[PDB]
Amino acid sequence: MTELLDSEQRQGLMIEQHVEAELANDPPNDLMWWRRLFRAIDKWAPPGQRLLLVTTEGRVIGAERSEMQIIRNFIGQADNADHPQKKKYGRVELVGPFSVRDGEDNYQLYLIRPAS
Question: According to the UniProt record, which cysteines are disulfide-bonded?
């Protein structure tokens, strides 16, 4: 588990703000409520990267089946949004958590990106 660079912290805060703003302007009238969330994180992912949302109940939005093992391992070690971190898993790297408010619901936001 590794400390973020100032640039990585700024990027996360910036992305969390854009995801929060997107959701604030997107009415929650979907038949599939999670699709609204996927629209926001698909749109604001940085090039070549993806975003994940985790609910307070421990459910992951945006992940592939192949990724649940490393996502599980990472979050099992992660701290609060007061101390986001990063970890490499072979060819990918997980970064977070960041924080996304959506009305009364709160999510943790993670980035998944090619490792470097």
Answer: none
